[PDB]
Amino acid sequence: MISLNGYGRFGLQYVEDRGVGLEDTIISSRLRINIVGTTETDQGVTFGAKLRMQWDDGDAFAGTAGNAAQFWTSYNGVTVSVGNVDTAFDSVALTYDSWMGYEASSFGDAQSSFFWYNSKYDASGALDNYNGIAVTYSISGVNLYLSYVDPDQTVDSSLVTEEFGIAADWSNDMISLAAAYTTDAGGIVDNDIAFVGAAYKFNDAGTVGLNWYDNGLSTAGDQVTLYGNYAFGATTVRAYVSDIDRAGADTAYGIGADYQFAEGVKVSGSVQSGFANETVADVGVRFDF
């Protein structure tokens, strides 16, 4: 069986003083198409394969291509994936919950380098022999994630640096806890990163959370992000503040709102301020199909 799903998004993206001779405000848009092939068996084992075709405004050649394939095998809550995998640091819950605006971005996200699912081709040739293995296991409320990425699997393993990651999250109706740790993140020797987060659903309407990160060799040093969101009917209000250890850094912060226009249609906007005083703002729509 083959299924297709995806989303389109478009709107305005403002970056205060983007560059000499550059427009501060542009129309930023993205089209994402996922192609999923699945083979269900009567033994209860599912085999799947996925390809992504994603286009972003500004992409080279004004064209769209597919990325590198991902394969998986699923059985009784256990999923083993091979190829262009989702990694543990990128898959755990809570780590991206300060996201806001129609481009779902946040200075409050971890400021470190690590591997993640590659949505597109890479013209440098760097990902040509990149291969990962990932294992996920889900119990009721517990999620365990394991990932191993070899950036160049054809070369002897002792000559290249592999990324190894582990992560777990747990949640009940009101409290959520999550943690992750990855050694040699991004294939960088000694870039060891970690995350610990917690969130409290202090109503059926609000949430407040706190994420803490060790960003390894990144110049940001350790980081803390405090975020919260509140739903008023169809409109959701979001905010966050984040601090890094880098000497002289500013406190980053953002404020935004989402409006659920219809099932699958979300109008979003945000005003954010970065660690180096960058001012960014956006307003747009995302529609899922």
Next chain:
Amino acid sequence: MISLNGYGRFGLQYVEDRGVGLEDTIISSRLRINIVGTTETDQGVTFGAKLRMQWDDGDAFAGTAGNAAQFWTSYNGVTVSVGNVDTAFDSVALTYDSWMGYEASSFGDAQSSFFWYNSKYDASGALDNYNGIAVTYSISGVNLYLSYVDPDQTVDSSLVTEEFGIAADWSNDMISLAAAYTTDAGGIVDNDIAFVGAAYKFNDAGTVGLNWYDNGLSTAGDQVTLYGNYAFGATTVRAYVSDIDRAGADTAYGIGADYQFAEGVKVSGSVQSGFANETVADVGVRFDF
């Protein structure tokens, strides 16, 4: 929801004396696949996104890629589109009705340069930050079209030339009228083009029309195309004659036929003569799927 549609076409394409060491007759073919994502809402607003994958014989690398995305929002007869848009000069009725043969071509088409929907990627890098906005409005019989194309939206607007186009068509059962005007067509300063056309359905079987163009900075100068077509059951006969103001130009003319083999299957052929005495002929099939 995601839908796929398209067409295939193949046949013979003859160009008298194509070139030294070249075959005059070749097998010319095209595969076109459109990927359309749509999100319908109960408020009556539809969101859509589209991608095209088109291959033509002779294409570089013997491969097919997707183009740059188009997004739209529709409500009550009004459609706003963003990204790789259809422009007003290319969308108006009548302007392409002298087309003939299985490759749907005609020397009688406007001899000017202007932007249009980009079916493919562009290896030059020229379309990388190209972005358009288009608005269409349809009443019963009236169609209004507006388009604005910025060839490089990241650069300050006063440093680049934007194309602005406007067009409208109207029709009842027998008479059709259409007009268009575009300033700085194709991003060329002072390339201002215009079109005015009219067609008369002098039966339920025949049509005769006349298109007039101002081709802006093109060397062709003003142009007039007179065309007609007549249906005899499943077979349609077509002809046209066209004249440009260029000094020394020949009258262009063409004669062709279509045969509707089945719903979605059209066999077509044409013999055409250009403004510089070029002789072209074709015969092939188009099938829609």
Next chain:
Amino acid sequence: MISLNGYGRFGLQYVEDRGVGLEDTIISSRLRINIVGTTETDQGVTFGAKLRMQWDDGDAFAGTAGNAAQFWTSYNGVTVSVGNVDTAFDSVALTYDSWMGYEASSFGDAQSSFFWYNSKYDASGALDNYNGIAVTYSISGVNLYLSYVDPDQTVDSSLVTEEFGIAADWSNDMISLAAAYTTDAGGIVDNDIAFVGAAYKFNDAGTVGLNWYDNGLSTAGDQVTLYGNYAFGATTVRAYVSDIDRAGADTAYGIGADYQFAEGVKVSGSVQSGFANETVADVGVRFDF
């Protein structure tokens, strides 16, 4: 109508002493997606078009693109195809029946150069004006195949070498016979190749066959491959031995097994030895969707 089908495969691929500084064992995988457009008519003539998107581990840019299109017209057992066609030497029965392992490979396959369906783009530019015509005709048990490939159809025909191929196979319940002949195979002047094969189904469980080849200008010279396979319920055991005329060559041989885990899911493995003493082994899964 547009349909999508394909397969995914992944597993281990071992090549004894692959290279200095290289890993002998790698994770080898392939994703194949076929896009088929078809137009059925009430006259009984079907028109079709096909595109393929295939990714293999190690592919340049860690991306996937479509190949060059194939078009066909079918009526009463006769199929005419144009464009990126399947050729007669590659389409006949029996010639690939010594295949084994999850990568379906065999040293026992013909050691010659010839054109075949191109699954992917070609960055060299070599296939840009490549065009084929192929005609197949199937009676009850008889299959006839004809193919003509022009590697650069834009250039005068007397300046380029075209491949012409013919093939036929016949089978009843127990005996199968097949033969093929191709002149200027692969666009190489005087590379004339041939094949003759026969297979005997000596049960409802086993098969033994013998393929013979004339490999034209290849250094392998003539070749003989003897293969057999036996089904034990869901598990199939396969073997082959092959000899070439090249001076000093070793006898190639392979042994493998398939396990039909479920409809559309096949687990396969093989250990093979080549004509130059190469030792290859594989183990993996293929799943069809």
